[PDB]
Ligand binder design. Structure first.
Ligand SMILES: COc1ccc([C@H]2SCC(=O)N2C2CC2)cc1
Length: 330
């Protein structure tokens, strides 16, 4: 089997991407944030504290003839940005772009943090990291991908995120029309539960490539590109007036600037992030100080190839017995 679904930016900055997901019978369609940096599929629901729901579409398990309470199971997750959610668990039928999994754990939120409430466009998350990170207790549950894998034509999914435009998540096949040149594959460590890999270096603008190993995660659920302080300083030094602002929480730059591109290495191959992709707009409405899309990972504990990086590429998440990651230009 295969599946193919369009993923759409939630706003004009590409802060996140939503993908429609069918849950239950009859289908209840929710727009979920596909997150290769976590492993829980959780939704706003009829069980979510009412004051914490503000415009989201909810899953109502009592209206699904295929929903079953997973007795005794609870979940609770905290994300890198400090957001969180928790609740109980059902199994139900879940379909993405025509690919159906029966008996998928659907984690129903009883509580969500304010950042989730405040984002009306995201109805939940669909985790695509390794199932070892799944938070359901006392019986850990599998991701949608992990459940689908054996049925797929090939044990892969691909992320093709757009810049200010829709893109695609495919399951079970590689669309050879969706990228240019070849796909370069690179090793993955699953030891931390992530799609963790090592970039071979970087360049800023038209500058020379610096060969240096940068260990990080491919994370569709993180907006920005978080890299070591040395790398980030080298980037922003090429932008007149850019500075790190402790009050704002990262590098800012004059909105009048033209940003240079940023290149990262994948083996001997190179992915070029256009300068425009690095602009996250005014720090507050009407400001001429703009927020940068490349920020320091110091204090996170890991480098994160988030959407800023991934949307410059066609990315293969190869879930073969030994997982790997592939990157192509597009
Ligand atoms: C301090 O200035 C900004 C701070 C943050 C952003 C973007 S990056 C990911 C994100 O969730 N953002 C908020 C607009 C929702 C943009 C500007």
């Amino acid at each position: 089997s295969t599946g193919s679904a369009t993923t759409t930016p939630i706003d004009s900055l590409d802060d996140a991407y939503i993908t429609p997901v069918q849950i239950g019978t009859p289908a209840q369609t929710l727009n979920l944030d596909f997150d290769t940096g976590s492993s829980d599929l959780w939704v706003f629901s009829s069980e979510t504290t009412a004051s914490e729901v503000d415009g989201q579409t909810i899953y109502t398990p009592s209206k699904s003839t295929t929903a079953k309470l997973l007795s005794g199971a609870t979940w609770s997750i905290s994300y890198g940005d400090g957001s969180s959610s928790s609740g109980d668990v059902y199994t139900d039928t879940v379909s993405v772009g025509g690919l159906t999994v029966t008996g998928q754990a659907v984690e129903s939120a009883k509580k969500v943090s304010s950042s989730f409430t405040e984002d009306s466009t995201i109805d939940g998350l669909l985790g695509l990291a390794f199932s070892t990170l799944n938070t359901v207790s006392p019986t850990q549950q599998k991701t949608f991908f992990d459940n689908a894998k054996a049925s797929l034509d090939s044990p892969v999914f691909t992320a093709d995120l757009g810049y200010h435009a829709p893109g695609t998540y495919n399951f079970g096949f590689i669309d050879t029309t969706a990228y240019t040149g070849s796909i370069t594959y690179t090793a993955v460590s699953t030891k931390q539960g992530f799609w963790e890999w090592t970039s071979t270096g970087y360049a800023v603008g038209s500058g020379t490539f610096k060969s240096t190993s940068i260990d990080g995660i491919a994370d569709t659920g993180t907006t920005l590109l978080y890299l070591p302080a040395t790398v980030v300083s080298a980037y922003w030094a090429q932008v007149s007036g850019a500075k790190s602002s402790s009050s704002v929480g990262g590098y800012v730059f004059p909105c009048s600037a033209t940003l240079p591109s940023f290149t990262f290495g994948v083996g001997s191959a190179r992915i070029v992030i256009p300068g425009d992709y690095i602009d996250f707009g005014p720090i507050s409405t009407g400001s001429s100080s703009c927020f940068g899309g490349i920020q320091s990972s110091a204090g996170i504990g890991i480098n994160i190839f988030g959407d800023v990086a991934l949307k410059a590429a066609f990315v293969v998440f190869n879930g073969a017995t030994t997982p790997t990651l592939g990157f192509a230009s597009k």
